[PDB]
Design a protein around this ligand. Structure first.
Ligand code: CA
Ligand code: CL
Length: 279
């Protein structure tokens, strides 16, 4: 299949060079897989989700997404127009309030919940978790992410928007998970993106068009936007049976476009997520 006039991020993730506008992908579209979006929630009623999204847990007075950050990320995972895995199942875990903030005790609880809840769900192709959040270093938050990954869940986390080494940010600094950096439409490192040895892969994270609350859309930037590209790619590859949750991040790195990115500090991987689709 192909999506003409697709957002640049999707087209980039299916091409070996920048500047294209079509998104080539196998029509399986991650069907059978599940992606947990641990964020500010999801506007499950958005027409772009086609009823494939639903809230499963909130730690606040409502499960409604009053911020839009979570909805934006969920859309890059598998919305009809702006998603990587257009046929995946989306589950929303609300660990951040409508101001995009939340305590580490809540975020940890949210991750333990996904490790157990997946046993109630029908996900024969695998389970993915997308965490577009993070803060200061914390071994407990790192430990929770490692537990989630260990439980058989492909965990993807944002590297942070500090233009610094991700070693001082959690759960980004947890080596056992997949830490995603951000790049712009010209194969340059996003000026805000963090770097470091702990980074595993880069993704489109500058000027990313996706769904927003109110049945609308808008373009924002951040490693929060690059992580869902990788999460959706994982669910996509896992449906095709090319990798597993335990080795997905490694498979994406071995099949990535290498050397295309610029402004990559020495010691940081120069890898760009890529589906390697052939008709
Ligand atoms: Ca890693
Ligand atoms: Cl913990």
């Amino acid at each position: 299949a192909a999506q003409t006039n697709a957002p640049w991020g999707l087209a980039r993730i299916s091409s070996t060079s920048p500047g294209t506008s079509t998104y080539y992908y196998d029509e399986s579209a991650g069907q059978g897989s599940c992606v947990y979006v641990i964020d500010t929630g999801i506007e499950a009623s958005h027409p772009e989700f086609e009823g494939r999204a639903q809230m499963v847990k909130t730690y606040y007075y409502s499960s409604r997404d009053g911020n839009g950050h979570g909805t934006h990320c969920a859309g890059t995972v598998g919305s009809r127009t702006y998603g990587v895995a257009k046929k995946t199942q989306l589950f929303g875990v609300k660990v951040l309030d409508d101001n995009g903030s939340g305590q580490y005790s809540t975020i940890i609880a949210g991750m333990d919940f996904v490790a157990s809840d997946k046993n109630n769900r029908n996900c024969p192709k695998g389970v993915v978790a997308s965490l577009s959040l993070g803060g200061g270093y914390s071994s407990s938050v790192n430990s929770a992410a490692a537990r989630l990954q260990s439980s058989g869940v492909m965990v993807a986390v944002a590297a942070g928007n500090n233009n610094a080494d991700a070693r001082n940010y959690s759960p980004a600094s947890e080596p056992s998970v997949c830490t995603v950096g951000a790049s712009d439409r010209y194969d340059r490192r996003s000026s805000f993106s963090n770097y470091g040895s702990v980074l595993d892969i880069f993704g489109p994270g500058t000027d990313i068009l996706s769904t927003w609350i109110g049945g609308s859309t808008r373009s924002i930037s951040g490693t929060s936007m690059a992580t869902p590209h990788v999460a959706g790619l994982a669910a996509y590859l896992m449906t095709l049976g090319k990798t597993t949750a335990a080795s997905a991040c490694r498979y994406i790195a071995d099949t990535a476009n290498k050397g295309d990115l610029s402004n990559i500090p020495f010691g940081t991987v120069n890898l760009l997520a890529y589906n390697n689709y052939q008709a």
